[PDB]
Nucleic acid binder design. Sequence first.
DNA 1: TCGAGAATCCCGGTGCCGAGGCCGC
DNA 2: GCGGCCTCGGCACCGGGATTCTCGA
Lengths: 108, 302, 326, 168, 195, 12
Amino acid sequence: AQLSLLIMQVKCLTAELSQWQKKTPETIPLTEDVLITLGKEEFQKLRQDLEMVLSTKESKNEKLKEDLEREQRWLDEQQQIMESLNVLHSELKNKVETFSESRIFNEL
Amino acid sequence: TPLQKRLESVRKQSSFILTPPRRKIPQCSQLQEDVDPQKVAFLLHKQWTLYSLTPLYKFSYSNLKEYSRLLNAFIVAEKQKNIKVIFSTLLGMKGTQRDPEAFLVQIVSREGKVLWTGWFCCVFGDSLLETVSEDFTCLPLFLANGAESNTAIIGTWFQKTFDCYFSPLAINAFNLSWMAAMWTACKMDHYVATTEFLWSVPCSPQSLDISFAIHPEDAKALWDSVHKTPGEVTQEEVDLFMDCLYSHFHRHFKIHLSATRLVRVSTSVASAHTDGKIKILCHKYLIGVLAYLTELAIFQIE
Amino acid sequence: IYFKNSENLWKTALLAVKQRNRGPSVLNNSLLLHYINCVRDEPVLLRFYYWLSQTLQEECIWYKVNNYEHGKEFTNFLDTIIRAECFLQEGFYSCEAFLYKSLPLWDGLCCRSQFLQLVSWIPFSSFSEVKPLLFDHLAQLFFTSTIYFKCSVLQSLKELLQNWLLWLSMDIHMKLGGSMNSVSKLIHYVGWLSTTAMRLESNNTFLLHFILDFYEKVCDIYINYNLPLVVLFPPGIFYSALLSLDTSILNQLCFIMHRYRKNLTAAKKNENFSSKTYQEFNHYLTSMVGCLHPSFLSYAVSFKWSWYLDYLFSQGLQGLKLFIRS
Amino acid sequence: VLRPLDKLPGLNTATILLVGTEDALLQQLADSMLKEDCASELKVHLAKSLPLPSSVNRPRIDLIVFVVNLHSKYSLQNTEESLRHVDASFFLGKVCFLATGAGRESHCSIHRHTVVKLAHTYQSPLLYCDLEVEGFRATMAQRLVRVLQICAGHVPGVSALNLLSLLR
Amino acid sequence: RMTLLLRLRAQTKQQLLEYKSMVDASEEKKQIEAKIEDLENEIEEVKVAFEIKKLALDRMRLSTALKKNLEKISRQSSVLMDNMKHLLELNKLIMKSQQESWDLEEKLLDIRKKRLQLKQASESKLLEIQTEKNKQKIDLDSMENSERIKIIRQNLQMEIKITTVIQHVFQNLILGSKVNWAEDPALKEIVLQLE
Amino acid sequence: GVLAHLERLETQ
DNA sequence: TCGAGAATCCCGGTGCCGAGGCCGC
DNA sequence: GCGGCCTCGGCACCGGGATTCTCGA
């Protein structure tokens, strides 16, 4: 049925796109109301999410300030291990690299 | 290649691209090289509780005495919280030459009363070898049989020293039906035990269990009814064998066995449970039964 | 037992002595996490992958027996995983491997806060090998769950966008096109995700706020990450927030498109984008700059054109400031 | 044989018809799907097999979720048998494949690929869950009820036909 | 009720949409790799056919809800406006809550960029340290020639093992006897024997 | 985070 | 052909780890 | 009536009795 369903899918998307293009925006029958019923409903829903989105965007900068402190601390511990590893690379360069086998036997 | 190969493997596995593994009927595995006849024969008719074992970091098949002492001194210390531990490479429990040699872990108590007899094997598990680095000696299968307390102690020791982790391998009833089908498809003679399928219906108040034990030769003749392509058993052939069982049980007792789940499939080749206490190895097909079991352990690890 | 001392009687004098001196396997190790952060070595990222896979499997099978009390250590362990990835900054290769395994089985709210922060740290794969495996399920639950899970995905994919664009910025630093096509397709698929989520919830302002929060990080691709990936709005969000009904979403869109103007101008300096992207942005401009109105009407009711401006502007409309100055 | 548009719709009635051999779990899912006081009438229907004994006055059925209990191969042999009595114009958007028992992964008589292959070869969404536990039911119930308002047309932007274009 | 009749209009303008789509599909009477391709080029083309349709619906809805609300300035007190003043307050509690956000996120972003620059840099540098330790591993193959290193190592191990025996019988002979151990300047350097 | 928060407006 | 010996199918009679109870803080 | 304590008991793996069936009186 996979192919028998793909063919009907393309046949149905064709009908739906030919019917959406038939759908002119029908704003003529829009609403007999003065739309205060829909207005003061939509602002009230706005009041329902605006408190509900300030409560989320306040936690957003809460976690962003907490993470700014945390990642500043991480960056500090990273530049420390960066300068430390760089100075270890420079020091381990031509200090332990200048190691002879016979000199290692003489140290023994 | 060292990790990204495993990531691509994980992608392939999670993709679930047309899985039905047409499997070769477990071929008579003539005992390869050494395979200590006394040891292997002791290892056959023992009810191994399967586990999935992640690859062991920094393991070597030379330092067996050091690990033996390190674990013996740990087990008897868990008694402080009489026992000898003998790591023993099995030398032949491997599918291909490149697989890691299977090695044992036996809690020998005075005499050779082997309390626990652990067993890590990696046979035909080259879907894990080619994805893990050289430092890890990967043995996906772990085999307990000793008390669960000692297994949950040696597993902790292995986690502590090797960074290997034991998930208890649970063969789902799908894989259980698969192995129940390829084991009545084998070419054996003198069937040791009847082909029993311990079903367990999902009733909420009660827990009725069914033992659909077939005569082993009668199930072979029933398998030949649904066996058409030789050499390899398909998912449809396995399902038709299982549905011939269903249509011989719902025919008789009017209860749809297909609405139940397999919990144990005893066969002349090898018994196999679900909850872990799975692999009894009646016959010497254990390199094929273990091949399936390791392939299933890869599924859990990977 | 464990350093339980008996010098407490002496610790009258010894507490005076303290006052006298005053006067006269690796996740729970932050000091060691820096090591694994710096070694992308084979036997350690694999010694660690196998622990994470078998901890996110065993302790997640632990859900199937409690699902209530085990749902607090798993949450607090996934929090440690999340923190370790935020520090170490690459997605653990068991974090995705557990996600593809446990996303299809996943519900909407079972450790949502942790699972949808794991998605953020997913090793950029192709968006052709990660889309069917994961994003085809972060749409299977995106379109069936409530707004409170919907906003938690375009936020999850918002952070995923940054965690992919970081690893692409230094892919410019450490010396593209086929990597380019991946973030572009991720953003379009979110841009496909975020036009139909706009339709499920009847243009809910909360959800489109998070949509723009995602797009607040799509305007600044060139300026921030040095990536030439200016991807404009799909109109199903652009005009849906243009003709929206609040300004905390209107000025949000205005900030995004101003950063879009800035990023396109910056891309014109260094250099398809030009033809169709500039056409679409001039479409989003002429239509909107002629349109720059309902939430502004709310302000005007609460309220000489320049004075109206000042009343605006002064009252927090900063995205409008950045546009109007541009 | 069920058809999507054989009956006329109501007003806010979104009639989903659960399909699964086990019926206590279907009853639990229906209870959880009506536990939340949604904005739509929710005349949930239950069943065992799609022949659906021919009783007129059955409303315009807006969703058939084939609850395939992965623990039991019967739930697939009774779904695949019941999948042949669904109209081909019904499989487009108004068909979901619930796979209860997934995630437990130890009782699964059915490999979850097989339900994946079944739900892909019929071109319909496949929503895993574990219906036995209310914690994964009271969130799958709010997924089936928002798919419901999509197929029943209650969200005035998305058809059932638009739905499968999202869950492919 | 009007809201309920509105939910009906909407629901029926979509149920008849589905009905007309199906009857048009019934009115009408292959390359599966492209059968999903000429399935995709509508799910993008119906998408541009109805996102513009919904976008025209929304613009004509907001234009009327603006003109209707343009009549709202002309009306009386409208306690709605008392609720909108607090929405201005909420906007201030969000657009200022975003004022940090385009700044806090900017700081976190260049913090993340610096951190990842030092992470790839540290991985390169620490890989250099590890390959230099590997170079010291070739220096390790410089001892396992074992022509005179092995014998001296063995006689060092067989002598320090006497020097860790005679030593610990000084920690046990200048302890058990009549030691007067540390009130003596000879033993004080011989007791407290360095390991 | 806003994910840990978005899990407590789902409840509340 | 038949009578004792060995092996092994059928189910014990045993071994041994979770569950329930129970006594200070 | 709880804290670390302890004691029955389902499940299950290993040890002889009677049925198979081969060989001697």
